[PDB]
Design an enzyme around this catalytic site. Sequence first.
Site, PDB file in Angstrom:
ATOM      1  N   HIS A 223       0.825  -1.205   0.000  1.00  0.00           N
ATOM      2  CA  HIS A 223       0.000   0.000   0.000  1.00  0.00           C
ATOM      3  C   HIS A 223       0.861   1.257   0.000  1.00  0.00           C
ATOM      4  CE1 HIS A 223      -3.558   2.481   1.459  1.00  0.00           C
ATOM      5  NE2 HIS A 223      -2.532   3.223   1.847  1.00  0.00           N
ATOM      6  N   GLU A 224       1.851   1.332   0.907  1.00  0.00           N
ATOM      7  CA  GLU A 224       2.739   2.490   0.909  1.00  0.00           C
ATOM      8  C   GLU A 224       3.527   2.596  -0.393  1.00  0.00           C
ATOM      9  OE1 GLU A 224       2.180   4.488   3.283  1.00  0.00           O
ATOM     10  OE2 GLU A 224       1.006   3.026   4.423  1.00  0.00           O
ATOM     11  N   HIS A 227       1.487   4.381  -3.160  1.00  0.00           N
ATOM     12  CA  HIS A 227       1.645   5.830  -3.038  1.00  0.00           C
ATOM     13  C   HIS A 227       2.999   6.268  -3.592  1.00  0.00           C
ATOM     14  CE1 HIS A 227      -1.973   6.638  -0.735  1.00  0.00           C
ATOM     15  NE2 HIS A 227      -1.609   5.836   0.252  1.00  0.00           N
ATOM     16  N   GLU A 262      -6.113   8.264  -1.314  1.00  0.00           N
ATOM     17  CA  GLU A 262      -6.290   7.018  -0.561  1.00  0.00           C
ATOM     18  C   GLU A 262      -7.317   6.089  -1.219  1.00  0.00           C
ATOM     19  OE1 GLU A 262      -4.386   5.885   1.563  1.00  0.00           O
ATOM     20  OE2 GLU A 262      -3.311   7.651   2.341  1.00  0.00           O
TER      21      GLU A 262
HETATM   22  S1  LIG Z   1       1.980   7.295   1.631  1.00  0.00           S
HETATM   23  C1  LIG Z   1       1.537   7.615   3.355  1.00  0.00           C
HETATM   24  C2  LIG Z   1       0.339   8.549   3.451  1.00  0.00           C
HETATM   25  C3  LIG Z   1      -0.396   8.289   4.765  1.00  0.00           C
HETATM   26  C4  LIG Z   1      -0.287   6.813   5.150  1.00  0.00           C
HETATM   27  C5  LIG Z   1      -1.261   5.918   4.393  1.00  0.00           C
HETATM   28  O1  LIG Z   1      -1.016   5.505   3.304  1.00  0.00           O
HETATM   29  N1  LIG Z   1      -2.500   5.569   5.013  1.00  0.00           N
HETATM   30  O2  LIG Z   1      -3.383   4.763   4.291  1.00  0.00           O
HETATM   31 ZN   LIG Z   2      -2.585   5.263   2.135  1.00  0.00          ZN
END
Ligand SMILES: *SCCCCC(=O)NO
Ligand SMILES: [Zn+2]
Length: 423
Positions: A223-224, A227, A262
């Site tokens: 997941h990270e 992003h 998200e």
């Molecule tokens: S990329 C980190 C942004 C905040 C953490 C997260 O992904 N929460 O779902």
């Molecule tokens: Zn996230």
Amino acid sequence: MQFVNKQFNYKDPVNGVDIAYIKIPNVGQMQPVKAFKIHNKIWVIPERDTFTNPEEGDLNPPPEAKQVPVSYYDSTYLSTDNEKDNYLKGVTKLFERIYSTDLGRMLLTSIVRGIPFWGGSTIDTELKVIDTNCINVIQPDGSYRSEELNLVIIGPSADIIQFECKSFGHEVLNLTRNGYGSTQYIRFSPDFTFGFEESLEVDTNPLLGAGKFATDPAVTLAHELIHAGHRLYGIAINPNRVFKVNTNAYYEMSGLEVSFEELRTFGGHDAKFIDSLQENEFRLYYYNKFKDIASTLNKAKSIVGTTASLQYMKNVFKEKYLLSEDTSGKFSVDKLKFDKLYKMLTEIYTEDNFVKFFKVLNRKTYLNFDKAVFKINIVPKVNYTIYDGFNLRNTNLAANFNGQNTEINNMNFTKLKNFTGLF
Ligand SMILES: *SCCCCC(=O)NO
Ligand SMILES: [Zn+2]
């Protein structure tokens, strides 16, 4: 078939190449920290992150001014060599778990190719690196040398369970949103995980459930990294583009809004809360940003540095952004290829898809409520493997996600804090 070719030990001697003391650039002033290059362009720093934000240098709670009830503090975590050794092996094991799936191999390949754009120049005719996309590596002779990199995994700051993506900004350019990209620092720990509830009605209710099932931390890291993929390609959605959650009575009774970024990253049904008109607005925006990058590369007629030739770097960014090249060496963006790269990074790389590949139990939506945080140890193979996570084949834990069932597999989880009711 191995993403991390060396099984690092934290106490392995420095060598100035892939085991080294490093400083991260222009961050006030810091002492160098021991860091480990686990793959081309990717480094791991087994330290609590007291560096990337000058506002966050203390590891015990604030004056509870912004105290989230979903939080966990322990100033001592990750302060000893044994913990740092275990953090390093845990993080490398999760990268192998991700890389063992077709989807994670694709995602990690996108990340390694996602080199932050060389848009630092003030002269249109010259291509130059952006300083904050490098680290300073102490060499065997004690001098510093600058090295470009895409991704750093670092330990969390004060709040152990606030995994955040940190990147250094620019005075004028918004590097994570203009197509350029920037080096990404992910606060993350493999030593804790979260509980969730197996029934949607209970999971999305803030008053119910203790967190019976444990999230697989490979999913959390993936997941990270999703992003980080958006941000390295400069296509992250502005965090104040949010969904006014109108599908959960508890979310809207409080003023709870959730960022489009998200919902995109979770995928599945959550991404449908981003409406077709604004989704298209975003794709056109980023399509134009890629064209500006094509324009900048065309206008470039000189190189800065002795690290590569001009049209070596031009070919680097031709491959990253999947640009078309005409008979005259002029770069353009093809819509079919852009739409395909954009969709890979935003629709194919999702948490919900990783769940399918790992065959784990997981929250069904981002629009739920945290239940609990557990202490875990995934380093021993009797606890957790690359191929099975907790649900070890040929044991009582193989079926029915029994390995993630913290009541069945109770010796693998220590509940540290409950969150249900605190909302
Ligand atoms: S990329 C980190 C942004 C905040 C953490 C997260 O992904 N929460 O779902
Ligand atoms: Zn996230």
